[PDB]
Amino acid sequence: EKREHEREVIQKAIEENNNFIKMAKEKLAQKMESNKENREAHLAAMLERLQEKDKHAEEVRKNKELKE
Amino acid sequence: MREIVHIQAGQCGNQIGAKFWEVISDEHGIDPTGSYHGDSDLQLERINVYYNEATGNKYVPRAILVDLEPGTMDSVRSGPFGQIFRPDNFVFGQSGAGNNWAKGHYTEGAELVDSVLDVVRKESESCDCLQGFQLTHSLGGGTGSGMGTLLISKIREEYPDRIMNTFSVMPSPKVSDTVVEPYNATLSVHQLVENTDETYCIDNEALYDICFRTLKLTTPTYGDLNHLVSATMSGVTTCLRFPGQLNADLRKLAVNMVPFPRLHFFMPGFAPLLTVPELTQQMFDSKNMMAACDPRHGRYLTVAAIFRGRMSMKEVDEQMLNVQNKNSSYFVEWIPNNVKTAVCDIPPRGLKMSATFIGNSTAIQELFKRISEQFTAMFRRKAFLHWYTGEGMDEMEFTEAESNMNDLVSEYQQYQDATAD
Amino acid sequence: MRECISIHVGQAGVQIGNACWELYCLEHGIQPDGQMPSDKTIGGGDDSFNTFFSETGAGKHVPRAVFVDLEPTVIDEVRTGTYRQLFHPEQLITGKEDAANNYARGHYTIGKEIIDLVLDRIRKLADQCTGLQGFLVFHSFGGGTGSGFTSLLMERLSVDYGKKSKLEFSIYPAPQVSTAVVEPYNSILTTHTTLEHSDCAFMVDNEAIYDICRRNLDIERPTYTNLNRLISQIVSSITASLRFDGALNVDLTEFQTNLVPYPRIHFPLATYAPVISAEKAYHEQLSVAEITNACFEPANQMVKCDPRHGKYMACCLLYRGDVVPKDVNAAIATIKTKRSIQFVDWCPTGFKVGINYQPPTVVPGGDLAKVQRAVCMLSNTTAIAEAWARLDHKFDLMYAKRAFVHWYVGEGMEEGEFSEAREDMAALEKDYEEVGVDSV
Ligand SMILES: Nc1nc2c(ncn2[C@@H]2O[C@H](COP(=O)(O)OP(=O)(O)OP(=O)(O)O)[C@@H](O)[C@H]2O)c(=O)[nH]1
Ligand SMILES: Nc1nc2c(ncn2[C@@H]2O[C@H](COP(=O)(O)OP(=O)(O)O)[C@@H](O)[C@H]2O)c(=O)[nH]1
Ligand SMILES: COc1ccc2c(c1)NC(=O)CN2c1nc(Cl)nc2ccc(F)cc12
Ligand SMILES: [Ca+2]
Ligand SMILES: [Mg+2]
């Protein structure tokens, strides 16, 4: 019985050293992925409105051509 | 190397841009040919920030000169250092802008923009690590105000991840008569609030008043004014151009100076127009502010102070601590340690000791309130709307630019009233 | 074996590595080209100094260190300075654009572009190790690299090296030498992200160091060079047990048994004496009992706080130089009666002492007096939580108006990371309350 216990304790220290490398590795990848989407989503929002600005400069120039 | 890219646009833009390079070229040891005849190597260590290195050891400003009338252009080469610039980097209209914003933004400026954008890219792609851009222009008339803000739009679209720093020159009825200026400025600011990270307000009303009262100039010229701007602009770039404690660049400035994206309009200051306490007193003195706004009427969100000269920085540390203690109610309490200072050993030409003061004060709403008022005096009348609706613009666009600038003042007030507890 | 790799991250971390590695060299007799006349074991050895220095076959002793910074200004000066020959190019790693004082850029935007290369270089240092003990990570709290790259590297080191030790030397921000108004944000973000991944962290309060410099060395406006040369003395003392042999010498790791009563309670208070100028140290020899006493004067601490108004969970004395146990024991006994030293009720009140005989060294042209004997006390006191309290308060003043918070959100971070970090800090401050309360 005592040796059964002795190997269960070393199996736990391994189990937990491992679960800890695991959850770190995963916590990282989750963060790095949510960060690319967020930063991109933000850069996309900036462009979508910088370009909606270009569409309004078409509409404005096409109005002065409805002057002549 | 961290390359800023300089862009002068319009009548006002190119002139204040010109004396800029004359001054910083002299500080750095560069004659109008582009060679270095200097004493100390502290003038070269970060020279690449504003200068292209050409073999034959020639330093070429990284400047893009732009206008809608070839007149302003010719003056530049003719003047001092005109031949230090890059001949290709001149980009010139012909038809001009005629103090109309629509002509700079939507129509005639549109026709020249892509010809500027091309010089931008050529200069940008030459950069190991592009900080971004600084645009010298005016918001009062024509090319600088409208094409300058259209160029801003286009550049941010190609470089959405670079810093956009402008030196905007605000109109003062004490310096120009053309009545459409309250229109031009307001339509520009509507763009500046949305597409720059840092705008130094150069106020022609405060430049005049300074020259008229302190400098006692009964009739100040656009050359006596621009003498003040060149002093300011050499100052608010000391930490970009010279080695220091802090590795200053256009983004570290923005991160630390701008607590809310829209509230990015800085009140500059200079002194003297001396001892380390007199400097500091004057530098925080509304008489030394290059924007007609009194700090004692609002609260400082954030402040930067450049001390230039040979002086005890222990003294400076106690002096700067002193002004925050004795003036504590004029710095927002919810942003700790929000007043930083830097000292550079080399002072500007002809001053043994200077100070330069960049502030982000809710009192800048004063500046914007004066423009807002002159605007509505015309817009309530519908005056000169034809110079604009004729070029294709909707009336809604004046309403919108107006509501936006009204919000910007409303937001400055929000944080002037904000408390910690 | 028991080799330690040091990692120096950002301006503070790098510049402090310059001070520490120039100091180690003077301590061990190593010259700026890496040769050591006293090492007769060429190309290798398991001498004590080899815990911090590998040896090339040509006789060069090479720091087991890596310098990482997101820009090249600061590390370019190592590459061209007095000790440029000491480091192999590949140990000195730089980017092109720094973090601009932004934790997000240090952790995600700019840092994600260099992390694999930094980890790789570290692996080449660990692969030269017969029994790697752990890492020593030097970094500011305040800078965007110091905070966000350190913590990215910490998460990574935990993945690639599991529970292998990671100690921190962390520069805690101070208004007199601060760079950025956002140092409180970077501070909390990195303290939260790192807390799980660090076994022991010695905080250095820039204001503590600045005051000691002004007051005991008579430097009017102390520089980073002034502060670094004092920090490296304290770092030297904490690592001297690793780098030196000695009968009465006690492994750092043995002090860690005592210093960390729970995983999160791992921030020991450092105190160092004598810090004394040459003129004031002339004709005035300071005895074992004088320097020991100085350790309990709060004005000699690395971090500003009142241990008097908190509780001790551990107190260690690391002596170097002319010191023998008889004196040490005498001095502790006087201090116990004449000073305010309350232990929590659940831990023994003995002092743990180590003595290294090699006397302290000073750096050419320094302001520190070369003394015959020195001491660094490492205490775990609840009082350190004050430093957390202050810093946590500056964070709050700003986050309630979300000032500057847009500079982080635009780089990809969410407000939720902010409240998550501040809550962790709120809990940490509550843990430090709980350990101090008596038992039932
Ligand atoms: N003791 C000491 N502290 C320093 C030194 N250099 C910088 N610091 C501190 O570091 C803090 C800012 O972090 P830095 O290390 O300078 O910035 P960084 O790590 O290079 O990260 P970036 O923002 O990307 O530049 C400031 O509060 C300084 O007090 C130094 O040489 N010695
Ligand atoms: N301070 C200053 N302001 C100027 C200068 N030149 C023009 N301005 C201002 O700019 C406005 C006119 O815009 P302008 O520069 O002529 O645009 P451009 O003709 O298209 O280049 C006027 O309100 C002037 O007050 C100058 O040299 N210094
Ligand atoms: C207190 O809040 C801050 C304000 C400004 C700054 C800063 C913190 N820290 C930084 O690293 C960039 N920086 C500065 N940037 C530039 Cl371009 N010029 C400067 C001139 C003087 C000066 F004190 C700071 C700067
Ligand atoms: Ca050996
Ligand atoms: Mg840096």
Considering the domain architecture, whether residues C332 and C393 belong to the same structural domain is answered as: no
- Give dist(CA C153, CA C159) in Å, integer: 10
Q: Specify the long-range contacts of residues C332-338, CB closer than 8 Å, at least 24 apart.
A: C332/C292, C334/C289, C334/C293, C335/C292, C335/C293, C335/C296
Question: Which ligand is the nearest neighbour of the Cα of C170?
Answer: 1
Residues from chain C that touch B259, judged by Cβ atoms under 8 A, are 398, 401, 403-404
- Report CB contact under 8 Å: B415, C394: no
B44 touches chain C (CB under 8 A): no
Domain B364-418 has CATH 1.20.120.160: no
C219 touches chain B (CB under 8 A): no
Mutation for B interface: A39, A64, A66, A68, most B CBs within 10 A: A64
- Report CB contact under 8 Å: C407, B255: yes
* C-alpha torsion angle, residues C120, C123, C124, C125 (rounded to 10): 130
Nearest CA distance, A29 vs chain C (angstrom): 11
**DSSP, res C287:** P
Considering the domain architecture, whether residues C148 and C25 belong to the same structural domain is answered as: yes
- Cβ pair B93, B67 in contact under 8 A: yes
The residue with tokens 């990848």 is A29
Burial of B223 (0-12, 13-18, 19+ CB in 10 A): exposed
State both tokens at B383: 């005056």
Burial of B380 (0-12, 13-18, 19+ CB in 10 A): exposed
Q: Cα dihedral sign for B386, B387, B389, B392? A: positive
Residues 6+ apart with CB under 8 A from C18: C78, C81, C83, C228
Please say which residue of C347, C365, C383 terminates a domain: C383
The whole domain housing C409 covers: 384-437
Q: How many domains does chain A have?
A: 1
Backbone angles phi, psi at B354, to 5 degrees: -120, 170
First to last CA, chain B: 45
Q: How far is the CA of B140 from the centre of ligand 2 (A)?
A: 7
- Report CB contact under 8 Å: C412, A42: yes
The whole domain housing A55 covers: 1-68
State both tokens at A9: 């304790």
Instruction: Tell me whether residue C254 is one of the annotated catalytic residues.
Output: yes
Counting ligand 3 atoms within 8 A of each CB, the residue from C101, C105, C145 with the most, and so the one to mutate, is C101
Considering the domain architecture, whether residues C100 and C239 belong to the same structural domain is answered as: yes
Which of B276, B263, B265, B201 has its CA nearest to residue B232?
Answer: B201
Q: Which CATH class is domain B1-259?
A: alpha beta
- Give dist(CA C99, CA B251) in Å, integer: 10
Q: Rounded to an integer, what is the distance from CA C93 to the centroid of its chain?
A: 21
Considering the domain architecture, whether residues C40 and C146 belong to the same structural domain is answered as: yes
**DSSP, res B35:** -
C372 annotated to a ligand binding site: no
State both tokens at C374: 């020195």
| CATH code of the domain in which C429 resides | 1.10.287.600
Which amino acid, residue C6? S
Q: How many domains does chain C have?
A: 3
Considering the domain architecture, whether residues C157 and C190 belong to the same structural domain is answered as: yes
- Give dist(CA A45, CA C240) in Å, integer: 55
Considering the domain architecture, whether residues C261 and C275 belong to the same structural domain is answered as: no
- Give dist(CA B169, CA B201) in Å, integer: 6
Domain ranges of chain B: 1-259, 260-363, 364-418
Considering the domain architecture, whether residues C287 and C375 belong to the same structural domain is answered as: yes
Nearest CA distance, A41 vs chain C (angstrom): 9
C50 annotated to a ligand binding site: no
Considering the domain architecture, whether residues C145 and C127 belong to the same structural domain is answered as: yes
Backbone angles phi, psi at C379, to 5 degrees: -115, 150
**DSSP, res C342:** P
Polymer length in residues for chain B: 421
Resolution in A: 2.7
Per CATH, the homologous superfamily of domain B260-363 is Tubulin/FtsZ, C-terminal domain (3.30.1330.20)
What method was applied to determine this entry? Answer: X-ray
Q: Where are the alpha helices (DSSP H) in C264-404?
A: 278-281, 288-294, 325-338, 385-399
Selecting from B105, B110, B160 the residue whose C-beta is nearest the C-beta of A46 gives B160
Q: Rounded to an integer, what is the distance from CA C185 to the centroid of its chain?
A: 21
| CATH code of the domain in which A46 resides | 6.10.280.30
Residues from chain B that touch C182, judged by Cβ atoms under 8 A, are 255-256
- Cβ pair C65, C87 in contact under 8 A: yes
Question: Of these residues, C90, C113, C254, C433, which one is catalytic?
Answer: C254
- Give dist(CA C239, CA C406) in Å, integer: 41
Considering the domain architecture, whether residues C254 and C292 belong to the same structural domain is answered as: no
Residues 6+ apart with CB under 8 A from C92: C67, C75, C78, C79
* C-alpha torsion angle, residues B356, B360, B366, B372 (rounded to 10): 110
| CATH code of the domain in which C186 resides | 3.40.50.1440
Helices (H) and strands (E) in chain B, counts: 15, 12
- Give dist(CA B106, CA C193) in Å, integer: 49
**DSSP, res B228:** H
Strand order in the sheet with C269-273: C269-273, C373-381, C312-321, C352-356
Residues 6+ apart with CB under 8 A from C317: C292, C295, C328, C332, C351, C352, C353, C354, C375, C376, C377
Nearest CA distance, B118 vs chain C (angstrom): 25
- Give dist(CA C331, CA C291) in Å, integer: 9
Which amino acid, residue C16? I
Backbone angles phi, psi at B337, to 5 degrees: 45, 50
